[PDB]
Design a protein around this ligand. Structure first.
Ligand code: AMP
Ligand code: AMP
Ligand code: AMP
Ligand code: AMP
Ligand code: FBP
Ligand code: FBP
Ligand code: FBP
Ligand code: FBP
Ligand code: CL
Ligand code: CL
Ligand code: CL
Ligand code: CL
Ligand code: CL
Ligand code: CL
Ligand code: MG
Ligand code: MG
Ligand code: MG
Ligand code: MG
Ligand code: MG
Ligand code: MG
Ligand code: MG
Ligand code: MG
Ligand code: MG
Ligand code: MG
Ligand code: MG
Ligand code: MG
Lengths: 347, 349, 347, 346
């Protein structure tokens, strides 16, 4: 069969529950608990779906991460005892990329920009990125294919200028506040563009480029690779620009392991089946399948989505769900009515 | 042992109301209220027939052999096939009753006017009052007022009660009433009592449900509208904890159905025949939508209080829907950008 | 001595108080009462401003309309000893077009699209429209000068399609629901556009054209002339397209005059010194002053502005105020705190 | 009496300051972001027919060139004022300014920064010294019921009852500072959620006043002048706001080389502050008969969206509050600079 049309809706509840869980730890100074409860909620809700999924991006390798590890099977239809209950569409093998708590320290500190997020494609349709750093360029649909990761920041800004029909001074670039980004940040400033420095969470940033209204027009710089794939899934559905390139030279940025060399990482990467380490991937290559689904729900408030709010009588969440199948981008504002609220606010 | 209504149905109905709304919206302002109606009907039906469910229409366009589509009794959904046990699971095979109003405010759509929507409600078999095509006196009010106002009380007394419940003056209340001659005295009374009023030319489903949300600046619906619209309204209010009561009105002196030589005595016979023992009965919304599970879904056609209208732009379409489920206990606003042809610009809002 | 910059701000309170007054009559079935209280409030509030105004568009002639009649002086600096208490900027002579309750029957019925509105310019800067009908064409800035009131609805729709970069099916035209538009409406329908038929209030209709987000892209057809001028004032500041042409032929439309004749109407027109009755005006002609101010506040809810809301402890209004002097379009969301409210809503 | 018109004119003051400062969003120059805002605000203020004295601002005349303590601002401070200013324009007023609140938020392009000011008749605003101030901000529903002298734990219980929601349904803003370690731990232990901010507690304080911000209290120590400016908004809104000067280096340090508790007290006495430990009421920090408050977002925040630059213009969002007209005004302004062919409704 083919990826069940219905899955594109069902993931709403996946990211919603994971975000609600993690959001209870907002500002409580426990990034690992914030992460853990989101992992658990996401895993529980996924296992209630009639699907046949494999984690290809997640919390770690099988023996580092107990839940949502790479290779893990999730979905009612992965159980031999239950397979008989699944229809042919539900039995289609799909690959899943999860990030139950994007911005664990954002949550721990109660700062903006965190979310519970996942992407899905049929088997093989999502790049199973290693836990390496990744050089990224995200930009809006109007700049897609025009800007390019190999060009300088200065040139890309000029191109964005022409594509978005506005001055460089009327552009905003998001860059992670990291020592690895000093020269880059300086270059963008000298070119005339405004900047947002973020402490964490460059999935939100990348995707914010797609929507006129966010006052964010590009993401430049190095973040984490698994995150990049998840971002690219959103951007491929939205027609947004997203390119990535693995960084493995510890001179540029370091993972922190006591290794710790370009040769060593090159060795690990080769043995992971990555033939060209310096390869540039466009958005269609990082998320390559025939069907791509993406779901995010805000934990703390952010550019695309409101944060989780707890009030007398319930919870309110905001999610963004994108499906290449229905070709839709849905914002879902959910009032979770917990104990018969006497007042229900419109917004 | 039974299946339970599939949790996934509460999300799939999003696409049902969206596709219906979109179709109808193409006819906004074209002065064809039947066309605007028919395309909505067809699109809602098609989208339902792709769902793994076993539905029976109990509120719809008319009787079989009269209405061609979504007639009373019509079977909808894939699990309605004879082969179904082979292709559907126990949750999906649960018999469900469905109330539809694919185009509520058909004339609003024809004139390009506010307040029309594609709407539907669901429950287990027998879980929705299969209302006849008669008029219904209604009282809708917000959750804070539930059980405190009452449909048999005068408008004057309900307003005082609302005033206490919503902690504001009668001058700070807004009541919706259909602009109809049958409401001359009622409107006069609301005016005398000091409340402000919104008169509507059509579409009292939106009016009733607007009462449930703070921010609509609508606090009650009073008066008489169509009965089936009342049930669909009640389904939503039951899930939200809102107040909704209804009472069949079958008296031509009060309101006429357009029947020839229509009479109260005539109307009762027709009502008796349908197994309606007490024509003067007052139902609250738990009785109008009494099933174990209740789902409600709406999508704006033209703009209104709760939902933006359908918008067509270069590269796609944008819809807003309200979907409510007693099962997940949720109220969902769904803002969907339908990307039809690779839009170079996508607006956040 | 030039129009006081500050007047651009003060007119916020003018429309606010007028709209609040009228709003108390929402749904009350009295369209003259709703009108009269807006008139009085707008006048009272104008008479507290240090300005020197003359009404050129208003409620009627002296010895007929009691308030805001043609020629009425309004403002503190119209007084005999004004040079004593008013500065030179405040003593500049300004002409003022008022429509204190635009959509009197909308208010009476509690229906959408009514507002309190006024426009201001130096003396001579606003066309003193007679009380005749006016054929109008409004469209967005990107269409300015490309569409034309003398072209057919069909031709204009084509031009709009090109200017707004969308199909005719993706266009929405507002036309007043009137027998006189039977044919115009049929043509728009045949051309493939969607339509909003309004029962009253073509001021809101015209200006909605100027703002992306309203899903309204043109106003076509005949309305009242003074309303047109006030519309043009706003459109000239926004760079929107607005043309108008007086209509005085009874076969086309009737002002309800007894034994009304076209030729009889021409006499009245000539009498006011209108040389060419068939003249087409663009908005720069209808609002030709060096300085143009416009202010509007929603009475009932509408496309551009939320209506007046009364709640426990206050009132909430939304206004739109535009100035060619400061070159600004301001949306003003005001919470009027009446009773030390215990709860203040963000929105 | 204070001119009714001033309550509107201050819209342009904060808008212009904000716009100038926003040009430096993320450029890494907190002092530039600061300077340009200071200049635009001063320049705009000097076009107003008012008789203003700065009681809170950039520093002493010797230290700070613009908007220094004591500076006269406004057309009606001119020697010829009687001849071209009416009596209301000639009323002496005091002014607290903070042209760029969150200089570093701007430099990093981070949320929470604003151009802000408050105004009262002469004597109407506490001319705070540049010392620290313990603060408690809360919504109108809690005004008088919470108290700054109670523990965070007590206040949270009181908040819960006043706001009719559980402590877990509360969110408390606290500045991310070593001085707040215990404070934060206590709030966490009581079960409330927390938003930690790197800077910008003016926004934090005032967000408690509006339902919909999902912020319910500010607790902790920030800068005192910012506190007065906050009090002015809260006094007009019916919000709870208390402050108390903190002047012991043991608690928090100002960086004075010979900074000592006794050192700071002598400084306080000199300024005419009789009781350094006095707990100030909202009505006492902004005690004038008439209070005005104006703010405009620089970067985005809880109450006000940031300055946006686009093709053909600029968009700002301001909050302007007046005890005189008893209004809270959100002002969303499209600044049309180059005849924009496209104008967004929002
Ligand atoms: N042409 C425009 N007219 C008015 N406001 C605009 C315009 N373009 C952008 N804005 C404002 O700036 C925000 C961000 O725009 P953008 O940088 O295109 O994402 C929008 O949501 C509007 O508030
Ligand atoms: N306490 C309040 N403070 C400020 N605005 C309010 C308040 N209550 C209601 N409003 C405004 O009035 C609208 C309608 O409120 P409601 O009539 O209660 O549905 C709200 O969406 C707000 O814009
Ligand atoms: N490119 C777009 N992407 C998503 N939604 C849009 C787009 N253009 C218009 N819309 C929606 O349609 C509304 C009206 O657009 P317009 O007809 O240009 O006034 C907007 O406020 C959006 O809700
Ligand atoms: N009773 C309610 N019903 C629905 N949503 C709510 C309710 N109360 C709060 N919210 C949401 O939470 C936000 C912040 O509320 P609060 O914490 O009271 O400021 C609101 O703007 C809504 O999005
Ligand atoms: O912090 P680093 O090592 O520079 O990596 C940045 C990555 O971390 C993130 O900020 C996520 O943080 P968490 O792992 O704490 O959730 C991503 O957004 C980004 O890809
Ligand atoms: O117009 P009537 O005969 O008074 O009936 C009112 C009913 O019609 C409606 O306005 C909808 O009318 P449509 O059938 O034209 O869609 C309902 O909202 C309302 O209940
Ligand atoms: O109803 P008519 O005679 O066609 O006049 C149309 C004019 O009336 C208006 O609807 C205003 O109506 P009101 O005079 O009742 O305020 C204007 O918007 C429009 O220009
Ligand atoms: O940074 P400190 O010394 O803890 O002081 C906090 C004060 O600084 C502010 O964050 C403003 O910072 P800036 O001085 O950079 O504008 C205020 O919000 C707060 O009152
Ligand atoms: Cl990494
Ligand atoms: Cl790089
Ligand atoms: Cl790409
Ligand atoms: Cl309320
Ligand atoms: Cl005379
Ligand atoms: Cl900072
Ligand atoms: Mg994680
Ligand atoms: Mg992450
Ligand atoms: Mg990290
Ligand atoms: Mg129908
Ligand atoms: Mg209907
Ligand atoms: Mg009807
Ligand atoms: Mg009038
Ligand atoms: Mg009018
Ligand atoms: Mg009329
Ligand atoms: Mg400053
Ligand atoms: Mg500061
Ligand atoms: Mg600081």
């Amino acid at each position: 069969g083919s990826v069940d049309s219905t899955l594109g809706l069902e993931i709403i509840e996946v990211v919603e529950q994971a975000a609600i869980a993690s959001a209870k730890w907002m500002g409580k100074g426990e990034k690992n608990t914030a992460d853990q409860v989101a992992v658990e909620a996401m895993r529980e809700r996924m296992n209630k779906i009639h699907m046949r999924g494999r984690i290809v991006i997640g919390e770690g390798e099988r023996d580092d991460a107990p839940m949502l590890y790479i290779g893990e099977e999730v979905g009612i239809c992965t159980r031999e005892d239950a397979k008989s209950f699944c229809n042919p569409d539900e039995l289609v093998e799909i690959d899943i990329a999860v990030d139950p708590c994007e911005g664990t320290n954002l949550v721990a500190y109660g700062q903006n920009g965190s979310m519970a997020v996942l992407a899905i494609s049929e088997k093989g349709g999502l790049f199973a990125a290693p836990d390496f750093y990744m050089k990224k360029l995200a930009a809006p649909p109007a700049a897609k294919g025009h800007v390019d990761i190999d060009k300088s920041a200065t040139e890309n800004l000029k191109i964005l200028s022409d594509c978005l029909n506005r001055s460089i001074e009327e552009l905003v670039v998001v860059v992670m506040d990291r020592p690895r980004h000093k020269e880059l940040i300086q270059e963008i400033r000298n070119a005339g563009a405004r900047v947002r420095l973020i402490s964490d969470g460059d999935v939100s940033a990348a995707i914010s480029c797609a929507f006129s209204g966010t006052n964010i027009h590009a993401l430049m710089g190095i973040g984490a690779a698994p995150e990049g794939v998840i971002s690219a899934a959103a951007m491929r559905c939205l027609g947004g620009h997203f390119q990535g390139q693995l960084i493995y030279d510890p001179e540029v940025v370091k993972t922190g392991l006591i290794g710790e060399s370009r040769e060593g990482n090159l060795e690990r990467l080769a043995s992971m089946g990555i033939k060209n380490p310096d390869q540039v991937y466009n958005c269609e290559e990082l998320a390559c399948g025939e069907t791509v689904l993406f779901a995010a729900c805000g934990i703390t408030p952010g550019t695309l989505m409101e944060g989780v709010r707890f009030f007398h009588g319930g919870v309110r969440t905001q999610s963004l769900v994108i499906s290449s199948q229905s070709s839709t981008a849905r914002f879902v504002d959910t009032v979770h009515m917990k104990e018969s609220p006497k007042v229900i606010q419109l917004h």
